[PDB]
Each structure stands twice: as C-alpha cells, then as structure tokens.
Amino acid sequence: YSPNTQQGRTSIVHLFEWRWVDIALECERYLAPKGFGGVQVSPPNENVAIYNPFRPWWERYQPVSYKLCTRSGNEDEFRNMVTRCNNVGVRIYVDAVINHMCGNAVSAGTSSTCGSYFNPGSRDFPAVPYSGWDFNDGKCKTGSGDIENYNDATQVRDCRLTGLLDLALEKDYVRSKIAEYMNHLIDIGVAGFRLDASKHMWPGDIKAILDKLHNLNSNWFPAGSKPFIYQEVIDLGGEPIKSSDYFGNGRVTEFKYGAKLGTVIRKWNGEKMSYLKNWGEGWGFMPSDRALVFVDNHDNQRGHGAGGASILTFWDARLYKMAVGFMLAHPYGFTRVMSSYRWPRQFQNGNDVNDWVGPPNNNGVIKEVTINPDTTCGNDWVCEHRWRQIRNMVIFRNVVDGQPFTNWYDNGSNQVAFGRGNRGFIVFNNDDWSFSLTLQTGLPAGTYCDVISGDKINGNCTGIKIYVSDDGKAHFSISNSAEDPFIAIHAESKL
Template sequence: MRRTAAALGATIMLSACAWSNAGLPASADETTEDARDSDVILNMFQWSWTSVAEECGSTIGPAGFGYVQVSPPQEEIQGTEWWTSYQPVSYQIEGKMGTREEFAEMVQKCDEAGVGVIADAVINHTTGADTGAGTGTAGSSYALDDFPGIYGPEHFNDCREDISDYTDRDNVQNCRLSSLQDLATGSEEVQDTLAAYMNDLLDMGVEGFRIDAAKHMPAEDLAAIKSKLSDPDVYWVQEVIGAAGEPIQPSEYTGTGDVHEFDYGRQLKSAFGGSIAGLDSIAEGKLDSEDAGVFVDNHDTERNGETLNYKDGDTYTLANDFMLAYDYGRPSVYTGYTFEDFDAGAPGSTATEVGDASCGAEEWTCTQRLPEIQGMVAFHNAVAGTEVTDWWDDGDNNIAFGRGEKGFAALNNTEGEVTNTYRSSLPAGTYCNMAAGTDCTETVTVAEDGSFEAVVPAKGAVAIDVEHME
C-alpha cells in the first residue's frame, strides 16, 4: 500500500530505534568480528527489489560478494529515464524499484544469503527546478521550493542558479547541480529530516550508504548528518569527483567514511587501452587504500566515456580481474543494462516502474554471472589481508604479481595467448585457475621452488590461491 506524503511527514520525524548488524570492515585492510565474509560490493544499477532479492540467493551470495549496492530507495519524479531515480520527491520507501514491503523482503533475503545491502542515498537535493510541479511515483505532489510535509523555501540554499564555477567552493556547494534544488544541509532541520530517512533504512536492515553528490555538500554537514544516525559508525562511501586545481578535494571527506577514487577507474581505462606495465604504482597520488572505494565503472562513467564499460568486452572483464586481484581500495563490481541512448532507463521501464531484471535477456549485462568475475571474487576473498609481492611485467601488456604466500595472478592484455614461467611464494601443489571460474576446469602446478608455467589466454588471466587447490 502506498503511503501519502502526509503520512510520510509523520513518519520521518519518528526517532529510529537503534539497530545493529554486521558492518563493513573498518578499512580495506582490516576485518571486524561481525563483518561480512567479503568486502566486495556488487553495484546493481536499476535492479528492482524483487530482482535483487532473487539474485542474492541464486548468485550473489554463493559467488562470495559481501554486499549489494541498490538504486536510491525513495519516491522520485516520474519518467522512464534512469536519472529520474536521482530526483527525490519524498522519503517514502515507495518508488520505481518497488514497494516498502518488497524492499524489506529484499534486505531479509540478501541477509539470509550472507549479503548486506548498501543504499544509494540522494541527500544533496530534491527535484530539478526545470521540471516545475508534478506528482511523484508514489503519488506525492511537489513544486518549486514546495514538498508538502517535508520541505519549504527555507530548507533550500539561497542560491537559485546552476553551478557555474567549479573553482569557487561556495558556488559548488550552495548552488544547483544541473538545476536540482539544493538542500540547505547546514540546517539542523534538514539534517534531522535526512537522518530520519536514513535511520528508517537502517531500521529495515540496510548496512551502509553510498552518498550521492557528496562533493556538493560541505564535509562538516555530512559529519553532522552521520552523527544523528542510530548507528553513527555505519559504513558509507561518498561520491566526490576530484579534479586538479579545484578547491574541493576527496581527501576532505575521509573523516566520516570511504570516498570513491575516480582517478582509479580513469587510470585503468588508460592502462588497458595502452600498457598495463605501470599498474604496480596505481595507488600513487590517490587516496590511502583504507579510504578508497574503487571501481572499473559506475552508472555515470560508463555513459560519459570516463572509464571502460561493458562495450569493451574482454578488456573490461580483465580490468575487473585486476581490481579484484590487486591490493588497493574496496572494490565495487558494476552490473547494469545495455544502452545506446545516454538517458535510456532500464529495459521495460515505465514512468512509475522498473521491470524485473533478467539475465536471460541480452539487455542486462549481469556481470556478476560471468565465470571470470565469480572466480576472481573468490580469489579476492582468499588473499584478503595480504600485500602485493613478486611483481613482474614485460614492460608492456603482461603483468604478474603475488599476494604474499596466499595467491598469485598473471594478466595478459594482448590479442594472443602467452606462455610464461612465473616465480611465486606459493607452496608446491596443483591449483585451480580462478580466473577461469570456480569449477576448477583449469589447473596450474606449482613446483617446490614456487615456480610454475602457465598459458595466459589473450585478454585473460590466470589466478591461483591456497584456498582453491585440487
């Protein structure tokens, strides 16, 4: 049953009961007693709640992912375009992805599969000023500076113009991002409203947040909001797109949680489009590993050309292999749908609803179903907590490295297979090649001195670890 905006107004002011459950590790290099078995996040862009629930049990949990990141769970404006999900009308958990009941069931089913849920939280703004008035996907009305029972003119920043100068901190954090009505997140009343929404999600079992457009909110505002949560130590990762010469930098936001390291994905695109030999220095000049959320692509960068995406085929898969094999940041694997039109919503979308995802249909990328990805998630989990050792490269597009005495990976970014002898710190034995999948159809034999010969396929990898041996 869909609740009215008036009912929401009463709901969001209720103080949430304290809720605790397994959280993400404190950092990419640390674990806590009650943490999920893996820190790998699967970003499920525009997947309905019922589709996520089903996939958690059938694929995501068994594959070893620790978390799923889901699209924003709030009422949004109507429209088939994907970006309508990022224009909140109210904080009802009723929207295009499904109902409140379906969301709660998704969280429960994912938890039963060993998977936590991270919610994409849109708290910087509401709807676009250019859209004027309308009715949201759950029936709530809205207009310029007017969200009945939630926000009025006093809850928005005074600047009513679009951002025009990214070298001006005040302009970036107080004016409108692409016409989106900018909330006055420094206001305690706004902070209370946003914290109540997030506490509602925590009460439902959500274990973390991705903070959309974090760059457009002062870091101290976000710290104040987080302090009002029922679990102020809850994991979150913040979207802060850094650029040289700008006054607002990702490092400002690490005090409250992880920050997405956009330069990581950019460098992967450059390297896999040229030479991967220099990837041993990929952490240089970036956020500390324990503060960085990393990805090959996300819903924005796959569309704007900033990173690789599914259209890059085997190169894209290989870049994900590297991310899962190497020791830097907290990895997020992306799964969405195919597109030609930048604005196109998920397959079968209507103005108020997103249809269920289907991995049997070509329109959905279903990266999590690829044998290579599932195998590399298992490899990542097996070598967690180890440093990169025994780096080797040919100066161009073949690299190899160990993960201490637990694992070893070799990547070939050329169009032909490569046979090579590698030297590892692994004990002797016969190992499953996890880069080929989890069924151990391919094996590698390591000698007493840690050396082994392997044939690395074109645009492919070999990855072995001590937890997956014959």
C-alpha cells in the same frame, strides 16, 4: 570506514536499477553462495516520474519525498529485501540522494513514483515536508542560481547542481529530516550509504547529519556498529575541492582509479601495465583505507559525471574483464563491481544520444531479471557480476584477503604478474605477442584450476590447469589472441 560485511566478504556489487524482489532473490541464489559482501541499491526514496524522455535512469536522482516507494518497489518489498539479504549474510547499501530535491523546472503536480504532490516552482514538497526556506535560493551567489564554476568551492556547495533544488543542509530541521530518512533505513537493516553528490555538500553539514544516525540493527550487526559511509566526490585534480576534505566522514569514491586503469589497459597516453607495479598511493590516489574503488560506475559507463574516454565498461568486455580482474586481485581500496543493463547506445558527434535510457521496461514497468540456464541474465540485464571471469575474481579477493602484494613480475611492457602472499597468483598478457614463461607464484606445490577460463568442480577443473612445482614456480602460456588474456589461481582452486 568499515563496510560491515560478513568476515571474508570483500566486495559490493551495484545492482543498478534492479527491483527489490529481484535483489532479494539474487542474494539467496547467488550473492551469498558466491561470496559477495553486499549490494549497492538505486535510490529507494520517491522520485520524480519523468516522461520526456521516457523514464530515464536519472529521474531517480530527483527526490520528491523520503517515502520508500519507487519503480524498484514499495516499502514492504524493500524491507523484505533487506531482511532476506541480511539473513544470508549479504549487506545492503543505500544510494542516499540528500543534497537536493527535484529539478527546479519540473512541472508541479503528482508525477512522482508514489503519487505525492510537489511544486518545484514554489519550493513545495509537502510529503517531507520541505518549503521555500529549506532551500539555498538566498544563499547561492551565482547569477543563474545554478553551479556555473567548479573553481569556486562555495557555489559548488550552495548553488543548484544542474538546476536541482539545493537543500539548506545547515538547518537543523533539514538535517533532521534527512537523518529521519536514513535512520528509517538503518533500522530496517541497511549496512551503509553511498552519499550522492557529496562534493556539493559541506563536509561540516554531512558531519552534522551523520552525528544523528543510529547504530546498525542489533539483530545482524554487533552492538555499536556504525554505518559504512562512502562519499561520491569526483576529484581528479585541478579543482579546489579535494577528496581528503571528506575523510572525517567516511570513505570517498576514488575516480582516479578507473580513469587511469582504463588508460593503462587501453595502452593509451604511453601507459602500460608494467607501470602498475606501484599501483595505489604511488599513482597519486587517496589512502587505501579511505578509498571505494571501481572500474566504471553508473554515470561514467554512459558518459555522465566526469565521463572520460578511457573508462572501460561491459561494451569493451575483453579489456573490461582484465581491468576488473586486476582491481579485484590488487589490495588497494574496497572494491565495487558494476552490474548493468544494456541500452541502445548511439553516438552522434561523440555524444551518446541515448545516455538517458532507463532500465529494461514494459511501458515504464521495470522488467524482472531472468536467469538463463547458463546462469547469465536475460531481459537485457548484463549481469557482469555473473560473468565467470568476474565472479571468480570476487572470490579470489576473499581467498587472499589480508595477504601482501608480492612476487611482482613485468617484461617492461604489458606482461605482468603478481601474487598475494601464499594464497593467490595472477598473470596478465596485454602485449601483442605470447606470454610464455615460468614464474615464481609464491604458492604451495600442486595442481591449480585457472579460475578465469574455468572452475574447480568436485576434484576437476573445467578450464586451464596450472602446475606449481616444489619451488613455487609454474609455467604460464597466454597467447595475445586469447579471448581472456589472463590467468588466476588461488588456495581454493587447488586440486
């Protein structure tokens, strides 16, 4: 349940579709000095090379083998990345696609990221190797062989998720091949895993696989360390499968988090920020120490997965930064920040016809992440984790780690504020009028740099300054027209 991050680092960032060499550099030049705890990487195992449409991001969720050979790089580049990141105190978490192999309708051949041969039709994946009896064909009871009804917990686990060949995870052979892959990664140095499509695997089968795993690499982790496990389970209620069924294996993705926060920030369905006073289990969420929270993820930012019209993404930058800021300031769960790439989003009758578009590329070859002079990224990589407003809140979370949620204030509408012990304080104005008020910050007297509008740089503030008096009170004035309608100050932004 522990992320295994360096003490003091409290977040992980999803560098979606980034190449290993770029992540390695990012760890050294940015993530380590800015206090990021780790990186969730895209699936590092060989996948199907899909040509229609042209190299979609989702081809990486169709395994062909467990060779560490993808568009992100080969095994040496992967090992190089893990070593360099661990050496600067930044962890690597692998997106483990272990529930299935490729789509059952994919043509047999060598159209894979490492050239390995595979034949979906005959259930032949010799690079593993897996054959017909390693899949759930005879186990599934639906007429199509695919999952047709989520109200039936059994078929959700034994049938094919959108046609993806379903591995027979009850078999010790299959469990062992998966463990072999995961242990290869653990020994290289990874700190944990995102277990993809966990809802589609029996909790008991996952347990059997995790039981075969090694302790983390003893060069970087204390003896007896166990990999951090966060399971992707979309549980919004209304289905028989519950997130709690997976608590014995590790943490679980709390999809209710971003769905509701999005609704609240958009001020939809009668919701408002003043209601966030009891944010957390009070809102029906799972226990804090079992939750992996996020505003958006790689699926729902593009309408995939549970989707949801309320989800906030970089496309709605202003509200997004506020949502991410609230998340990073609030003690609930372990936080994951999304880092995306831009694609030509085009809605036709409510559906984005380009929701498949893969990462920036030159005829299939992923583009490097270039860093602009102002520290933003080029080549259409959004790099939300480099946005000052988000990066500074990442450190805010580190600075206030362990401090209690306190000094809450709300105007009965959308102007709220709260502190974390005596280490940090944050103020939000999401109402259609100015927030002008003197509030108890719980902080020591002094001059604090607002880390949303600027930074503290050698004795100065490059943005707004907040003055906390002897009684801990400070005046805040945030116009509803502000491009960033929130202010945050903490122990380390004090002059």
